[PDB]
Design a protein around this ligand. Structure first.
Ligand SMILES: CCCCCCCCCCCCCC(=O)SCCNC(=O)CCNC(=O)[C@H](O)C(C)(C)COP(=O)(O)OP(=O)(O)OC[C@H]1O[C@@H](n2cnc3c(N)ncnc32)[C@H](O)[C@@H]1OP(=O)(O)O
Ligand SMILES: Cc1nn(C)c(C)c1CCOc1cc(F)ccc1-c1ccc2n[nH]c(CN(C)C)c2c1
Ligand SMILES: [Cl-]
Ligand SMILES: [Mg+2]
Length: 384
C-alpha cells in the first residue's frame, strides 16, 4: 500500500515520465514555511544530535549499526561498517552535524535509531541540483515495524529543507516508490576456500575445491605497471579525469576539488584509490572502499572482508584490463571478494573477469524529482 510513501513527493508505482520531463514534483518551496518544531517521537524517546567527530558518539553509532543494520535477504550477513568509515562517509565537505540524527531511549540513554544526510551536487539528465544524500537509516531490531522510520525520514527532510534543499538521492535494496534505476550486484571471488567454507560460493562434482581455487587464481602483476596509491598532489588530475568521465551518465555527483580530496585520498581499511601518472598527468584511476560483512553463525569465520568497486576510469588500457588490476589490488590488500554493481561500464567485464551474479539489486531513488527512469549502465554514481 505504501501508506507513508504515497504522502511524499515521489512517483506513484505506475508513474512513467518521458525524457521531456525533468523537474520537481513540488516547486517554489519556501524556507520560511518549513516547520521549526522537531517531529514527535513516542513517549520515552528523544532526538539526539550525534557528533561523529567525537570518538564516543561515533562508537555509539558504530554499535547500533553493527548489531542492527542491513542484512542480506537470507540473514547470512550483516554489514559492519567500521567507525573510521563512518567518520569518512559523514564528514565530507560542507557536512552538517545537525543532519546526523540519533534517537535515544531516555531511560537507558542508549541510541536506538539513526539517519544521516550529506550535501552533494547531483546531475540528473543534465540538470545539476543541490541535493542531500541520505544513508545509514537504522532502527534497533527490538523496535521494528512501529513506524519509527517515517519519523526519522520526515525529521531529516525538515532539517534538509531548512537549508533550502528540496531534493535528495538515496539507495536501498528494498523496492519503494519508485526507482530511477535498478542495478544488480555481482561478486568476484578472491579467497575461494573461505567463500566455500561460509556457503557464499559452491562446489560440485566437476568443480572440486582444487579446481575452484585454480579457476579464480590471479597473476600478481599489474596490466598498468605504474598504478600506485593516490597522493595529495594527484587531486587536481583525478578531479579532471573523473569529472570529465562522469558527464556521459544520466545520474552522477558533480565533484569539486575539495570533494575529490575527501572521497578519494586513501585511508587504510576505508578507501583505496590508485592512479597512473604519465608526464605529471593522471590518465587512469581505480578506487574501491572497504565494507566488511559480519557472518552470522559461522563457527570459523566472523567477517567477510569485501572491497566494493567505487570509481574506475581508463584512458591507456581497456576497461577489462583496468578492472583486472582493480581485482589484483583488492587481493593485494587482503580482501576476500570484490563486489560491483552493473553501473557505468561495469557489466561489460563481468563475464570475462569471472564475476558471479548475486542474489539481489540496489535501487536508486530521487526525492521530489520527476524524470524518465533508465538502465543502470546510465547510472554514474555509487553510494556507500
Ligand atoms: C529533500 C530532502 C528529503 C530527505 C529524505 C529523502 C528520503 C530518504 C528515505 C530513506 C533512505 C534510506 C537509505 C538507507 O539507509 S538504505 C538502508 C536502510 N537500513 C536498513 O535496511 C537497516 C535494517 N533495517 C532497519 O533498520 C529498519 O527495517 C528500517 C529503519 C529500514 C525501517 O524500519 P521498520 O522496518 O521498523 O519500519 P517502520 O514501521 O518504522 O516504517 C515502515 C515504513 O518505512 C519504509 N521503509 C522501510 N525501509 C525503508 C528504506 N530502506 N528506505 C526508505 N523507506 C523504508 C516502509 O516502506 C514503510 O513505509 P510504507 O511502505 O508504509 O509507505
Ligand atoms: C555481502 C553482503 N552483505 N550484505 C549485508 C548484503 C546486503 C550483501 C550483498 C551485497 O550487497 C551489495 C553489493 C554491492 F556490490 C553493492 C551494493 C550492495 C548492497 C545491497 C543492499 C543494500 N542496502 N543498503 C546498502 C548500503 N548503501 C548502498 C545504502 C546496500 C548495499
Ligand atoms: Cl506528519
Ligand atoms: Mg519502527
Amino acid at each position: 500500500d505504501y501508506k507513508f510513501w504515497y504522502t511524499q513527493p515521489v512517483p506513484k508505482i505506475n508513474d512513467e515520465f518521458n525524457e521531456s520531463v525533468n523537474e520537481p514534483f513540488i516547486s517554489d518551496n519556501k524556507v520560511e514555511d518549513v516547520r521549526k518544531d522537531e517531529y514527535k517521537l513516542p513517549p520515552g524517546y528523544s532526538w539526539y544530535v550525534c557528533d561523529v567527530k567525537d570518538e564516543k558518539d561515533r562508537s555509539e553509532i558504530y554499535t547500533l549499526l553493527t548489531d542492527n543494520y542491513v542484512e542480506d535477504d537470507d540473514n547470512i550477513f550483516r554489514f559492519n561498517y567500521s567507525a573510521e568509515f563512518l567518520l569518512w562517509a559523514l564528514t565530507s565537505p560542507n557536512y552538517l552535524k545537525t543532519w546526523h540524527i540519533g534517537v535515544k531511549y531516555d531511560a537507558s540513554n542508549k541510541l536506538i535509531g539513526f539517519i544521516s544526510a550529506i550535501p552533494t551536487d547531483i546531475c540528473i539528465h543534465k540538470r545539476t541540483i543541490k541535493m542531500a544524500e541520505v544513508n545509514f537509516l537504522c532502527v534497533h531490531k527490538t523496535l521494528r515495524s512501529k513506524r519509527l522510520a517515517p519519523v526519522l525520514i520526515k525529521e531529516i527532510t525538515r532539517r534538509i529543507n531548512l537549508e533550502n534543499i528540496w531534493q535528495a538521492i538515496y539507495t536501498a535494496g528494498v523496492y519503494l516508490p519508485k526507482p530511477v534505476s535498478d542495478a544488480r550486484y555481482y561478486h568476484r571471488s578472491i579467497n575461494v576456500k573461505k567463500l566455500i567454507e561460509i556457503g557464499f560460493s559452491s562446489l560440485n562434482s566437476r568443480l572440486t575445491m582444487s579446481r575452484a581455487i585454480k579457476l579464480y587464481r590471479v597473476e600478481d602483476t599489474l596490466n598498468i605497471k605504474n598504478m600506485r596509491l593516490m597522493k595529495k598532489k594527484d587531486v587536481e588530475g583525478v578531479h579532471k579525469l573523473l569529472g570529465s568521465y562522469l558527464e556521459q551518465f544520466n545520474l552522477y555527483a558533480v565533484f569539486t576539488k575539495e570533494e575529490i580530496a575527501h572521497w578519494f585520498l586513501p585511508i587504510e581499511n576505508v578507501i583505496y584509490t590508485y592512479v597512473n601518472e604519465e608526464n605529471g598527468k593522471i590518465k587512469d584511476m581505480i578506487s574501491f572502499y572497504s565494507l566488511p560483512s559480519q557472518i552470522l553463525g559461522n563457527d570459523k569465520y566472523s567477517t567477510l572482508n569485501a572491497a566494493y568497486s567505487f570509481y574506475n576510469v581508463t584512458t591507456t588500457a581497456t576497461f577489462k584490463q583496468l578492472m583486472q588490476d582493480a581485482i589484483l589490488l583488492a587481493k593485494r590488500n587482503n580482501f576476500d571478494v570484490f563486489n560491483a554493481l552493473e553501473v557505468m561500464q561495469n557489466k561489460s567485464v563481468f563475464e570475462d573477469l569471472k564475476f558471479g551474479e548475486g542474489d539481489g539489486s540496489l535501487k536508486y531513488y530521487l526525492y521530489n524529482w520527476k524524470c524518465a527512469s533508465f538502465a543502470p549502465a546510465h547510472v554514474g554514481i555509487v553510494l556507500l
